[PDB]
Chain length 295, copies 3
């Protein structure tokens, strides 16, 4: 079966904060059941005659495609709305004809604006520097499916943690819902994990017990102890073939993409390079989210 | 369901280019077909009617709402859509589309582009806006709106407000209403430079005469116009012409009336009016998907 | 409908990159499969053969016309399309890997001739080459062969002229390779200004097969009465500022119009991959031997036949 996760039915998907551990577990397992079927040649007509509409004020072919492909693989349909008309006027236009909106916008508070006037679910595909929860959830699914489990892991977050909307959402989702041992906040000092992200996290950091061992650049303590390396762009941070020596045998590298120098192509064929497999997990997590919300 | 949703027969095979081609019988037949489809789609049903047919948009002009309304119609009837983004002539572009398609939705800035396309197309064309000419589907959904909000089209007093000279919406709505309905009065609210052209109004003189329809121009949105009108149908001006509709002017209006707009909108339609139960212009978009569902199915059945 | 629409088994899982990869039997397989498709679609019937399967574009040129012919074939097979726009300097290889994550087949068009060989090297899914610089347009060559076969009854025994910018024409590079290697062409006329003649690196690799089958090859720079009165197929292309593209006399010499068509035989066809400029007069359009618009319908059925066979 592919029963939907009941608690998302009709819900908007704005923040990682809204997802309980039972929620995550269920989506992780719906996504896998789905992968099992798609990989087996099965066709899913779960969402026929239902329409998703992207509302991408900023371009991103990968995020766009992944949502589309996911909707299509559930039998659903896609109608692009290329984007001065006010945001609300657009939101009401999409509500005319679609069942679910998917919005990517450069201002953080554009999301809260839209939800005030929206009659159908809005899925947040990302907003300025705040969040990007379907990424956080797809990243967790990657880890669950690559390493066996997410409980007890050590995780490194490389790159500018200030602007990177993937690292915030992930940091919240993981700490709040799992038993994370350590978290290497690796970046330049100026471009680090903001105070407002780290502050609401402080209850769980204590009672679970969670080492936030920061670092200016990629130390060997990181490479040695990390089960997951989650690097990002910024446009002694590079992960290359040389440095990968120091990694354990059961670990993975991740990157949401796109990339620059900070992750060498010299790592691509390494079986612990999970950054490409991560995108396919993405399609499957979004199929699980789309079915759950629109069921 | 060929049972519960029977297409309009006059439309089968036909290109849809002007208001002039629709009879009054056709209009109510479309309106009833639209409503039957709204009940079926709102019940959560999946219509399978145009499985394997392809709709191909051909927009030589930016218009996301029109495109998406049309794509949404087609899809909810079970049809498919092929995106074509606009040296190479118009005819050749048409003959190309024609090689894999079941219906074309064209939207061009030049007025005569439609005659050019029709001259060569083998599959039906629906005109989604041809220069300063017409927008026949818009006028058909606007009429569905009037009917579904007010319960009758005969006897209304209507204000066409804004750029009347270049508004392909208002050209089509005026033609559609005057020709096939007993319109009491029509306020032509606009500056003299943006007035309703005489070659839209000439062909109607005879029908205007017979049905006894008052044709009244004002350069500004007066209080007579607000108090008498059952539909205020407003449009943009793409410095100081006084035609704006806010919540204050809405104190002058009747209780049973609607405000309408094809969209997008500028300063002529304040967001103060939105909450008002007589603000129809958001419901107008939804009605439009169902009329377009009605039309597409009728064209292609 | 798998005894109704049998896929060409030799093509299963393959990327389609070059015309040289096809045998005579393959081509006839695809023609017969494409005709069965026209029978299905023209009967008003619907197909589910690629339900659930996704095609995406990896287009670095822009040619909506071509991505649309492909979309249309995929959609009529019951399949689906996810668009993907390319604009950054993110690597070609990463673009491929990102498409691979959710697609079942890629349709590639790149202006560099040898970006296809890069994609193949990293792709885990079949790539359909929809044009590579001055290289090949293989699907195009296959639908052109289907056209000729449908309209004249057979391909062996034809005289055919290839007109226009042959140096850069990729449609003609592939059509020439396909025709000469698998059919007994009576004669190819290469009609083009000297600077834009069919390249030597295309012709030299076909010399054994020419010599052996006795194909006659005549260059000209003009549509001489010989060409018009002997050709069963007039395959012209478009010119893309160097001396020959600039010359009015180069244009007038290769142009087909109502006038020149008076010299042509009762039973032949005029073909063009589209789009066209002035080299093919709109005065030829009414002529029943103008097969360039029908060419587009054959093309849909030939892409259906190719995709069904790659993805079955």
């Amino acid at each position: 079966e592919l029963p939907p996760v009941a608690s998302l039915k009709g819900k908007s998907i704005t923040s990682a904060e809204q997802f309980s551990r039972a929620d995550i577990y269920a989506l992780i397992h719906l996504a896998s059941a789905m992968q099992r079927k798609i990989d087996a040649g099965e066709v899913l007509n779960l969402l026929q005659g239902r329409i998703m509409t992207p509302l991408f004020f900023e371009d991103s072919s990968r995020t766009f495609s992944s949502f589309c492909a996911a909707m299509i693989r559930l039998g659903g349909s896609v109608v692009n709305f290329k984007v001065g008309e006010t945001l609300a006027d657009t939101i009401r236009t999409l509500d005319s004809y679609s069942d679910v909106l998917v919005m990517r916008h450069p201002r953080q508070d554009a999301i809260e604006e839209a939800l005030s006037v929206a009659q159908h679910p809005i899925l947040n595909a990302g907003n300025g520097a705040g969040e990007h929860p379907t990424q956080a959830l797809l990243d967790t699914l990657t880890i669950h499916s690559e390493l066996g489990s997410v409980d007890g892991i050590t995780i490194a977050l490389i790159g500018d943690l200030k602007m990177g909307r993937t690292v915030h959402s992930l940091l919240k989702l993981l700490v709040r819902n799992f038993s994370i041992k350590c978290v290497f906040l690796v970046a330049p000092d100026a471009l680090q994990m903001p105070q407002d992200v780290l502050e609401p996290l402080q209850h769980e950091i204590a009672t679970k017990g969670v080492i936030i061992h920061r670092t200016h650049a990629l130390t060997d303590e990181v490479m040695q102890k990390s089960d997951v390396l989650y690097t990002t762009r910024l446009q002694d941070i590079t992960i290359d073939a040389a440095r990968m020596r120091l990694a354990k045998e059961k670990m993975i590298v991740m990157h949401p993409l796109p990339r620059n120098d900070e992750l060498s192509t010299t790592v691509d064929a390494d079986p612990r390079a999970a950054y490409f497999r991560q995108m396919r997990y993405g399609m499957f997590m979004r199929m699980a989210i789309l079915w759950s919300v629109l069921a």
